[PDB]
Structure formats: C-alpha cells, structure tokens
Amino acid sequence: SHRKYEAPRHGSLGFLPRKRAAKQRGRVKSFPKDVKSKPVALTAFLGYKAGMTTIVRDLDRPGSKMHKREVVEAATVVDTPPMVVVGVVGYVETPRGLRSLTTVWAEHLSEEVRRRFYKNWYKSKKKAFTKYSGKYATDAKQVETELARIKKYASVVRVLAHTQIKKTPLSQKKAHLAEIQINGGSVSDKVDWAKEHFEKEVSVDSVFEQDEMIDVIAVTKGHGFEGVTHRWGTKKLPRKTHRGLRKVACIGAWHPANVNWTVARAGQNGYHHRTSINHKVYRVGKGTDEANGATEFDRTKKTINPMGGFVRYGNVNNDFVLLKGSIPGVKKRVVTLRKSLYVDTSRRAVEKVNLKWIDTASRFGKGRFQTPAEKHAFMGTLKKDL
Amino acid sequence: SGNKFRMSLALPVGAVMNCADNSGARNLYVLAVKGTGARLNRLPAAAAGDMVMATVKKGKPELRKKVMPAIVIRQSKPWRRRDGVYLYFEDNAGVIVNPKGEMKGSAITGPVAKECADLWPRIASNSGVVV
Amino acid sequence: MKIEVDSFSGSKIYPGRGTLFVRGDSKIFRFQSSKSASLFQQRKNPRRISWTVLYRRHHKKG
RNA sequence: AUAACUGGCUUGUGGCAGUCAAGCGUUCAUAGCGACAUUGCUUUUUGAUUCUUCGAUGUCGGCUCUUCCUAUCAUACCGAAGCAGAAUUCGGUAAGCGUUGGAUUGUUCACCCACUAAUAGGGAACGUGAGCUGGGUUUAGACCGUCGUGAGACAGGUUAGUUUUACCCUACUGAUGAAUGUUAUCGCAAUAGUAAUUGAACUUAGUACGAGAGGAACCGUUCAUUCAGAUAAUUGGUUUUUGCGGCUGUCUGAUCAGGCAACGCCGCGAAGCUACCAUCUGCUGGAUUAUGGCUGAACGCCUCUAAGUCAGAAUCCAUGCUAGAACG
RNA sequence: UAACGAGAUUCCCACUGUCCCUAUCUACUAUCUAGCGAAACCACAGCCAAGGGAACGGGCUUGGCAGAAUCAGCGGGGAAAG
RNA sequence: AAUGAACUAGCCCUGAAAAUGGAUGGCGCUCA
RNA sequence: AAUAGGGUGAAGCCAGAGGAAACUCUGGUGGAGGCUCGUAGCGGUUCUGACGUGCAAAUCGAUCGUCGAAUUUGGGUAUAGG
Numbered sequence A: 001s002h003r004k005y006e007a008p009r010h011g012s013l014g015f016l017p018r019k020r021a022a023k024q025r026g027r028v029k030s031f032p033k034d035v036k037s038k039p040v041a042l043t044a045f046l047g048y049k050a051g052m053t054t055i056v057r058d059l060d061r062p063g064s065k066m067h068k069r070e071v072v073e074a075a076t077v078v079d080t081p082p083m084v085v086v087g088v089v090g091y092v093e094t095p096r097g098l099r100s101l102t103t104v105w106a107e108h109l110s111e112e113v114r115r116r117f118y119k120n121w122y123k124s125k126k127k128a129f130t131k132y133s134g135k136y137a138t139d140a141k142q143v144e145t146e147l148a149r150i151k152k153y154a155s156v157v158r159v160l161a162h163t164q165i166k167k168t169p170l171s172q173k174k175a176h177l178a179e180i181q182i183n184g185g186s187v188s189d190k191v192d193w194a195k196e197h198f199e200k201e202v203s204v205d206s207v208f209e210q211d212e213m214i215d216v217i218a219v220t221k222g223h224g225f226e227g228v229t230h231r232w233g234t235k236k237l238p239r240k241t242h243r244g245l246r247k248v249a250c251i252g253a254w255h256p257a258n259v260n261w262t263v264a265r266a267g268q269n270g271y272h273h274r275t276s277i278n279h280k281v282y283r284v285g286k287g288t289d290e291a292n293g294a295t296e297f298d299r300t301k302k303t304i305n306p307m308g309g310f311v312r313y314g315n316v317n318n319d320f321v322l323l324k325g326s327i328p329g330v331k332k333r334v335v336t337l338r339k340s341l342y343v344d345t346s347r348r349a350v351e352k353v354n355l356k357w358i359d360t361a362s363r364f365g366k367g368r369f370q371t372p373a374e375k376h377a378f379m380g381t382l383k384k385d386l
Numbered sequence B: 001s002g003n004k005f006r007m008s009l010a011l012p013v014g015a016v017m018n019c020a021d022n023s024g025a026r027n028l029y030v031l032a033v034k035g036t037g038a039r040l041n042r043l044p045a046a047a048a049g050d051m052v053m054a055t056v057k058k059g060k061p062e063l064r065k066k067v068m069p070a071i072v073i074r075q076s077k078p079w080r081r082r083d084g085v086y087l088y089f090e091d092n093a094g095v096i097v098n099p100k101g102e103m104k105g106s107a108i109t110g111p112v113a114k115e116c117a118d119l120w121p122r123i124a125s126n127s128g129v130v131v
Numbered sequence C: 001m002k003i004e005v006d007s008f009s010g011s012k013i014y015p016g017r018g019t020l021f022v023r024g025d026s027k028i029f030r031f032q033s034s035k036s037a038s039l040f041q042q043r044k045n046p047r048r049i050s051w052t053v054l055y056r057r058h059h060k061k062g
Numbered sequence D: 001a002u003a004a005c006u007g008g009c010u011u012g013u014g015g016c017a018g019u020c021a022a023g024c025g026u027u028c029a030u031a032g033c034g035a036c037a038u039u040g041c042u043u044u045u046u047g048a049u050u051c052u053u054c055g056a057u058g059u060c061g062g063c064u065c066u067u068c069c070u071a072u073c074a075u076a077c078c079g080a081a082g083c084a085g086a087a088u089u090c091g092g093u094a095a096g097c098g099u100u101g102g103a104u105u106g107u108u109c110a111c112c113c114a115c116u117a118a119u120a121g122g123g124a125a126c127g128u129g130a131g132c133u134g135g136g137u138u139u140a141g142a143c144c145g146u147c148g149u150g151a152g153a154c155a156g157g158u159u160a161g162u163u164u165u166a167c168c169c170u171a172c173u174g175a176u177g178a179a180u181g182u183u184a185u186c187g188c189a190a191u192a193g194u195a196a197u198u199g200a201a202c203u204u205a206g207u208a209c210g211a212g213a214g215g216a217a218c219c220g221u222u223c224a225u226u227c228a229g230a231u232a233a234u235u236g237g238u239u240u241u242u243g244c245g246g247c248u249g250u251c252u253g254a255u256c257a258g259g260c261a262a263c264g265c266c267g268c269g270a271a272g273c274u275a276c277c278a279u280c281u282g283c284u285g286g287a288u289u290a291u292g293g294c295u296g297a298a299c300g301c302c303u304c305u306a307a308g309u310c311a312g313a314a315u316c317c318a319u320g321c322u323a324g325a326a327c328g
Numbered sequence E: 001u002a003a004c005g006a007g008a009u010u011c012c013c014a015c016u017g018u019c020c021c022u023a024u025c026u027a028c029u030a031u032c033u034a035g036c037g038a039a040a041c042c043a044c045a046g047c048c049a050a051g052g053g054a055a056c057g058g059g060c061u062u063g064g065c066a067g068a069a070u071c072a073g074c075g076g077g078g079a080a081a082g
Numbered sequence F: 001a002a003u004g005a006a007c008u009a010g011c012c013c014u015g016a017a018a019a020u021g022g023a024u025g026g027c028g029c030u031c032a
Numbered sequence G: 001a002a003u004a005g006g007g008u009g010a011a012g013c014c015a016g017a018g019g020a021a022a023c024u025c026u027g028g029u030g031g032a033g034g035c036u037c038g039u040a041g042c043g044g045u046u047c048u049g050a051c052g053u054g055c056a057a058a059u060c061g062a063u064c065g066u067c068g069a070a071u072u073u074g075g076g077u078a079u080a081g082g
Ligand SMILES: CN[C@@H]1[C@@H](O)[C@@H](O[C@@H]2[C@@H](O)[C@H](O[C@H]3O[C@H]([C@@H](C)O)[C@@H](O)[C@H](O)[C@H]3N)[C@@H](N)C[C@H]2N)OC[C@]1(C)O
Pocket: D119
C-alpha cells in the first residue's frame, strides 16, 4: 500500500557512497575550461585552513533592507604561503580520455617536497631524484628534448607545485604536492611559463584577487561510525520502542527481497570529499604586512591572528585568504582553492566589499579585548606587573 | 508588503501569548501561521512580525470562541539580526488585527520589535518604543 | 560600528557578541557573555560582584 | 479431501474509458454536457471458487522508511472556449518535483477546523510485528440486555488481560585485503549514482482590456518555503575540565588541608560536540515532447509532412558533483 | 447516596524532551586482547529479472552477469527458528 | 487529358492506462 | 513468636461562662477507632522497564497497595482423588 502521507527523501542520493575519502588531500576533478586568448596563469592554489573569525561590512545591494548598512558575517582564514613550482606534465587527447605523456622536473627539489616520496624518511638514504639531477648537470639536453615533446604533442599542460609547509605552524614536515592546470596562451607558452618558474615561488595574489568568487575542495571532518538518526536525519522512533529508537523501522518491503541501496543505513559519517563553490574573497592579506587585521575604518596596528592564537592551529604568519562563510575541512587541513568554472554576473558576484573591522578577540573563550594593549588599558596595572 | 529576513521561530501551534492591545482580549492562542507549507510532523510556528490565526482564551466574551487574525509583535526566543545582534524580549505578545493587517484596538502596551513595525505600518502607528 | 558596554559587568561588547535583552518596561540591557546574563537573571547585584566595573568603582579600585 | 488471510482464474458488483446522438446549452446535437442503447479496460471494492498452505507463511490500524504506477491535485510548456480583462472550464506532452498541521473515533473509512502552489489516487504478501506499538479483533476473570428449563448462546454492549530468538547464509551499509618484479608519488576515467524546489513582496501598473465594476503578464529587484551539502565566527544547548566558587551532614582533636554521601547538592564553566535554536553554499551547454511554423509535392489548387526544415516543456544527454573497475 | 478506591472515563490548573526536533554528557556493554567456552538450527545449499511451474524459485528455461580471504553493523529475504 | 461519387478488403496508424528492470527465449532484423 | 516514628482526637473527667427553667456555650484533660501519613513486615499496580538459549521452569529495578488487625508467621495436628 502507498505511504499514508508524503514526505521528501532523507539525504541526497548524489553523494554516495558515504565512505571515507581515498586521500586526505582533496583532488580537483575538473579545471576551468581553457581560453587561449587570456594571459598564462594558474587555476588553483593550495593552502591550510587556520580558523574562522567575524568581520563587519557595509552591504551594497539596492533594494535590500540592509542596503548601505553594517552587517556581521562569519569568515574563514586560509593560511597560504607561496607555492614552489617543481615540474610540468603534458596531457594528450585520446579516444579513451586524457593521457599523460611525460613529466619533467626541476633540477633541485627542497627537502620538504622530497620528504613526500618517503614513508620512513629518517631510515632512508634520501636517493629520490638524485640520478634525475644528473640529467641537468651534463648539458640539460635531455630535459629540453622532453619539454619539446610536451610542446609538440600536449593539449593540456599542468604544473607540479608544492606547499612550503614549514612556514606554517604545522608539525608535519612533508609538503603537499599537486598538479595545477595552466590556462591561457598556446601550449608552447604554457611550457615556457612552467620552465621559467622551475624552483621559483608563486604567490596567492597572482592566482586569486580580492572580491573573486572561488571554490574550495577539501575532505570534511571525520565522525567515524554513525547511526542513521544523525547520518541521514531520519525521525527518532517513539520512547517506548523495544530494543531502541535511533533506527529506521522499515528498511524495505517484502519484495524486492533485498535491501535497497536507497535505504538509510548505519555507517561511516564525515571525512568525505567535497567541492564547495562560490565563496567570496574578502581579503588577500600579506604576511609582511604588520596590520593584516586592520581596515580603513579600524586603524589599529593589528594582525589577522586572534589573541592567544588560532585554537589548535597557531598563528598565520604568511599570506592568507579571508573567505566569506564556511568551507569544508577542519583546522590544519590542506584545502585546494580553485577558480570559478563559470562566469557570474549577479550582484553578489560583482559586489566590491570594503571591510570595516575584523575580530581578533580570543577564540579560546569569551574574549572581550581585541589587543593586549586594550586589555591593559581596560584593566589597569596588575600584581604581576608590579 | 515587505521582505523580512528569516527569524528564529518562537510560537508553535498551541502557544499562548499575551495580548498587547486594548481590544479587551488578554490572551492569544496560536492555531495557525500564515505562509506555512508542508512538512510531515513539523508544527507551524511564528516569529515576530508573522500573521497568525488565533483565538482568545481569556478576555471579553464577545471576542472569545472565534477565529481571528493576529500579528506577533515581540518574542522571548532569541533571534539574530543581520547586524549580528542576538536579542529577545521578556515575553511573547501579539495584537488582534484585520486580514489587511489593521489593528482592532488603538493602543499598544510595551515595546514592539523593529521587524514587525517595518512590516506593518498600522501597528507602527500605534506603537511607542520600537526595538 | 560602535562598541557597547555590558549593563552588568561593564565589559566591552564588539559586534555580534553577547545578547540584547529588552525588559517589559522597554529598557534595554546588554550582556557580553552568558555569565553576566545568567548573573543578571539570577537577580544578583553587580555592585556585590567583585570583578564588575560597578564593584571596582564603588570600592575605589584602580 | 474443508472454511476463516495473501496469491491464482473470473470480474457479476465496485472503479475508469469509448461509440451513437434524443435532448440541454438565449439561436446551435457535439464550447461545455448528454438520455435510450451499446463496446471495452482495470484489479485500488465486494463476491464467486477452493488450486497452494492446517508436523502453523504471526491474523486490524497507526507509527517509521524506501521505491514504483499514472487514470495529473500542484508546479513547466502548450491547444480549446458560450477565452474582452480577472477568474474559470475542456484538452495535450508530462510522474522531474511536491502533496501538510489539528478536534472526535482502535479504526481503514467518515467528518469538521486551518494552513497551503496543492492538500491527486493507487501498488509493493490488502509493503512494512526476530522494526515497534497493542487501542481493536480473537483463549481463560467479570458485568449487562435479549434468548435458553438449564448447562449455556449472541457480525449486541462493557471492563481487565506475558507480543519470544539472529552470533548463520544472502542482501544492504560501512571497513580491510592476497595476488599482479618491489616500492613511492602524480594522474586518467569505463561504469554506477546525482539535486534542487515552490512561494511572496516590490516593479511593470491602477497599465493593457473593459461603458463600468473590476483588472493581468514578460524583463528586473529583494526575500522566503521544502530539500541538499557543509561549518562552529557568533548566539544557544551540553560538562568527569569533577576547572573555580558556594552549601548541608558526618569523619580526620581544633586550625590548615582533606575523606565519604553506590558522580551528595547548587552557580558559573572553557575545550570538544552540536541547532532553520546558529552561519555558509547549491552550476551551464546540447537534443527533444506537446504545440506553433517554413519551404513543398502527392492532388495544375491546397496543405507544418510525404523528401527536407525552424522554434520549442519542471523532459533527456551532457557540463558540474560523488565513487573509482579492489582481475581498466 | 457522604466516605472510601493501584477500578473505567471527561475537562481544568500546575508541570514537563510526549512532541516541534533533536543535541550533549556519565557508567556498564558492545569492540580488541589473554584465559575459558556453550546452544538453537542444519536435504543440499545460498546474486538477481522474467517465464513457465503445486497458479509468489536458491536450483529449472532465457537473459543480467560473475575474482581469493574477510571485520563491525543490519534486520529485506531464507514463505528463517520455536 | 483524364476526372467525379459510392463502396469492398489487405498491410499500416488511432481506439490500447499499473504498479522492482525485462522479455517474438535472447541478440538483433526493415527489397527482413 | 512478631509489628519504627508521626497525625487525628471518640466516650469519661476538671474548671469557667450564660440561663427563670429546660438546658446550653468555652478552655483543658483523656486517649477510642476492622481511623490515618509512613518504616520493618505482608502484598503485587504500572513501566505492558530489564531479562526473555535468564541470576531465575516466574527473577531483577523503579513505581506501588496495606501496615494494630477479617494482621503476619514457625512448629504440632486434622481433612485424600468423583
Ligand atoms: C493530518 N490531518 C488530516 C487532514 O488534513 C485531512 O486529510 C485529508 C484526507 O483525509 C483526504 O483524503 C481522504 O479523502 C479522499 C477523497 C477526498 O478522495 C480519499 O480518497 C482518501 O482515502 C481519504 N483519506 C485528502 N484528500 C485531503 C487531506 N487533507 O483529514 C485527515 C487527517 C488525518 O485528519
């Protein structure tokens, strides 16, 4: 018989299976479509999620009730030191899809990226790329022949780049290595741009500007094994239910005589790969700027970090990206930032934001001061101050 | 007429709020909320500025035993405005109105939430302090 | 944006922090945290709570 | 060998659809209806039967949850009108997406109140009891009425009446993993899945249309509903941080400092977790259906159709998103 | 018919996680280990769709398909067991 | 330089709506 | 043989007040009752809680009825299968 009353399905059938992600680094499934007539540029950048804060802004949306009025908004800080380009990969079109033709590497690789090729670095002889380095030392002619191959045959060119994880407070010493696609120009221009950046640093401000709408790819917070009530949001059974109530009462009809894939079941929750789009860039701060957290209206000589540090992360001492709202992942998680895959002309996409104030009170409790100086001014001298 | 942002709901069906005008009613019992769609087992619930369908449980006899519109003017469930302020009043209260949003009484006791007065000009006319 | 003052403790209230209470007599009270709001609702006298600004001024401290 | 469920045949009865056209419809059979007759379809009604099960297939309803059908209530686009407008009615492609909160009743059913875009109808062993519940039915107690000489009877009423087991196989949900010279890093993408939804206000505009009364829409703007995926700034909830403070009784002679009250009690309480109780985010190309067209014969005329061809739906395939074949 | 009632019933006040709509915390389990170590049940067994068939198949016919060894859960099926 | 009416009966189209995905046995087949 | 601690406050008795009388009123005292709140005890309402191959062929937790008598209970003794 039919359901007595109608209700929408619990959970989405498009995020299946609800399993653990295959890798902790989130991969870019698709890159922005290439436009030959643009300047040669990177399409993505890797950073580390540091924490969240609060900002104040004036809204510019005519017709809104909050137009020309202050709004308070959550925002996320991504620690983004510059990346180092260490290689290049060429891809050829085939009737079976993109196939990588060859990979060319820079002459010198820093210890933090070479740690990525090891499970037991302290017990190894550190031989990675040691014979490859001699392909440059003689006359580099083999390297140039490989790059000529990429120019002749590739249709898609991506650069190999790694984070400088030792500029973050993370105790992990392995750097994160990723392929970032080069868009714009001819294939030959792409290879030349990759070559001139071998061993060089590329900064966030060259990929992402301020007011841009960008996407974040990351693995979500893990929760382990979870029951259906919280994993899928199903209704709790009545209090007097024998053998428990955090369940789905009927997991299927008699026929088909099999449990259907569409039925909510207990299993692993969180730690999923997600691609979230349309997060506005509120700031591209600079690590050398000693007033990262200051605005035009709030002139206090202040960094983006909250008093006491970001909880369970540390201090953000590099370039950073302040993003509107929340993004997938937890503190310390490597996040991949990607350019938008489409052109957006709506007000929210084209609005220019001007920050009034950024919060820097402690995230470790009910912080009521923005600065040590303000704390001292409010409380006066203390016993430990003599 | 107007477009108020989503507010934390305070008064589900069955809630009894104070009646704040001088119509002679003392209570207002919520039995429906205008604009409530469909969702199995979810109670209709109102926030400040919402029109409800109400009866008068305690008040003048000629007002009782009848279904009438009413508008919520304040609530004690905290809600967050777009400026980041979480605020809340001491009690939940409403006023008896017309289907067109026009009050039945002529005076309002106590403060009126800014969202309600922005949405309802006739209540704003009879209001004193607006927060 | 303007900084507000806790009605109970005197601590500074930055945008978004704390709660706003409107008493039935239309008077507005601001609290920076749930501690001061809880102490207010318990009907504690802020002049008898040692860490408040009212206490410290009433006892001539600082 | 034989009744009381499901299932099977049947389809009278129930339900749905056609054909004809006497009449209704100010004139006019067919805009919309449609008598007397007559052809079917369905298996969501109830029977008829007795094929299966009596070394037992758990026998109402509700709750929960998934999926399917279309005979479409709403939402998309359209054709018709006894379509001026507004509203409404008839019809097509359409099941992509939704279809609610309550009073009485054990109820399915019924019936009101109310919200809503709408409150369509059905299937899945009359889905669903090792998922629950147990109000009803249908053991034993007891009461009443009518019946019976009586023991007792009663699709008459009433009250009280134990709801057992999974650790196996498969399925499902997640989780490892041998073998592929070893080991490590970066990738591709077959196939499978897939997601958004509906409304209001402003503007158009007191405009088109209309004698008046009344009274739209496209582009656009701001919000919101239902849903989905995250996140923990903030606000709220939570406390074995037994972190700080307070309180009673008793014990360590007192003080200090502590023990116990089968976490003794109270206020606050970071961190972590978490809430439409909080915040953020939810993409754009191609091909079509209905339908309207172009050119154009058949058939010297005509005709959207026969050849060819244009536009065109909440449809479809992609883009995008999830997994990644553990023998690619 | 006062009083009485673990009797049946209706409404009101108070009260509340019964509910909207769920969240969080503790102990003991479950879990993993050392030692110890049962039972029910068992024709043979164990992936689906349709067909025909004792008219609802794990096996039969036609298709879909199909890769060792497995762990925690689970209550669709085994017209599961008793 | 052929055309007009009425009609007959072949194949084809309409009439022709159900619930897990699925059955001319399957693949597929169109001067078959 | 056994049965905490409270509440209520029956007759009888003392004192005072009113009244022409008949009688009546007030304060104490007293300690009645198959009376009452509530332990031990005896019982067994509800969760239709746990358990339901149990600790157990009837148990366990909370909740609950009664608790000075038609009360509870040891031992002895009698009644024996239509
Ligand atoms: C949750 N409240 C609902 C209340 O909304 C209402 O529901 C009706 C429902 O009974 C009606 O449905 C009813 O009537 C239809 C008939 C009209 O076609 C029957 O086919 C159907 O079997 C019957 N349930 C349905 N068509 C509208 C709902 N709002 O009445 C039933 C109810 C349970 O009280």
